[PDB]
Amino acid sequence: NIAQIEAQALKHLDKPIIDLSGWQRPEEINYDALSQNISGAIVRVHSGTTKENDASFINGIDKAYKSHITELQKRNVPVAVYAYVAGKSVQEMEKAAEVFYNAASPYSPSYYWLDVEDKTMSNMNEGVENFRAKLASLGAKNIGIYVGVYFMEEHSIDTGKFTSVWIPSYGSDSGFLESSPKTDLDYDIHQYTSKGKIAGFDHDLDINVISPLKNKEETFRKLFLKP
C-alpha cells in the first residue's frame, strides 16, 4: 500500500537518489540489492542521433525504461522520470513532450523532469517552455527542470513555472559529494557525480542528494511520494 512505500522511504531517506538510462543495462543490475541501497530513482524515458545505439531507439524512446521502472516499483522504490530536451523547433518540442508523457504516464511516475543541457533552439528558454507547457496540458502535474547553473544563466532559462529544480555540480567527479551548485536559486536536488558506485551494480552511476538547504523529509515527499 501507499503507507508501506512511504514507511520504506522514511527508513531509507539517507540512502542516495540515483538516475538511470538505457546506458545502464537492466541485466547488469541486481535490482534486489540496488533497491535496498537507494531512496529513489529517476529513469530516462526519452532523448530528443541518426546513428543507432544500445540506449535508445531513433525516435528517442529509451531502450531500458520499462525494466528500470517496473523492477524498482515492484520493490517499493519510488520512481520519477526524465527526458533529454533537444527539440529544434516548437513542433519538435511538443512532439517530444507527447512521446515522453505517453510512454511514462502508464507507470504513474512521482515526477516528470526536463533534462536541459544544450542549446537546440535559438531561444532555448522558449523551447523549454514549449516542452513544459505541452506536458502540463497532457496532464503532468509535477514538472521539474534539470539544468546546470552556467547554461541556465547563459540562456536565461526561466525556472519559475517549474515545480522543482534539479542541478548538477560534480567538482572533479570523484564519485563523492565535493561541490554544490554555484547559485542562490532554491533547488531541491543536486546531481553530485556521474561516477558513483552503489552495491548491486558494477559500473558508474549518477548520484543525487536532496539539497541540505531544504527540509530533507518534506522535499523527498515532494519529489517521490506525491504522484
Numbering used by the authors: 15 to 62, 65 to 243
Tell me, in the authors' exact words, what the paper reports.
The sp0987 gene in the S. pneumoniae TIGR4 strain encodes a putative single-domain protein belonging to the GH25 family. As mutational analysis indicated that this novel protein might be involved in host-cell invasion, we named this protein Glycosyl Hydrolase 25 relating to Invasion Protein (GHIP). GHIP is a novel type of GH25 protein containing a single-domain catalytic module, which differs from other known GH25 that contain at least two distinct domains, including a catalytic module and a choline-binding module. Functionally, GHIP can hydrolyze peptidoglycan using the active site located at the mouth of its barrel structure; in addition, deleting the GHIP gene has a strongly inhibits S. pneumoniae virulence.
Therefore, in order to better understand the function of this novel virulence factor, we elucidated and now report the X-ray structure of GHIP at 1.86 Å resolution. The GHIP crystal structure was phased by single-wavelength anomalous dispersion at 3.0 Å resolution and refined against the diffraction data acquired from the native GHIP crystal at 1.86 Å with a 24.5% free R-factor and an 18.0% crystallographic R-factor. The final model consisted of 227 amino acids (residues 15–243) and 200 water molecules. Due to conformational disorder, the N-terminal residues (1–14) were not represented in the electron density and therefore not included in the final model. Only one GHIP molecule was present in the asymmetric unit. The overall structure of GHIP consists of one domain shaped into a flattened ellipsoid with dimensions of 30 Å × 38 Å × 40 Å. GHIP contains an inner ring of seven parallel β-sheets (β1–7) with a protruding β-strand (β8) at the C-terminal region, and an outer wheel composed of eight α-helices surrounds this inner ring. 14 amino acids, including Asp56, Ser58, Ser84, Tyr121, Tyr123, Glu154, Glu156, Asp157, Tyr185, Tyr209, Asp212, Ser233, Asp243, and Asp245, form a negatively charged groove at the mouth of the GHIP barrel. Analogously, the four corresponding residues in GHIP homologs, including Asp56, Asp154, Glu156, and Asp245, are also strictly conserved. All mutants showed lower hydrolytic activity compared to wild-type GHIP, suggesting that these four residues are located at the active site of this novel peptidoglycan hydrolase enzyme.
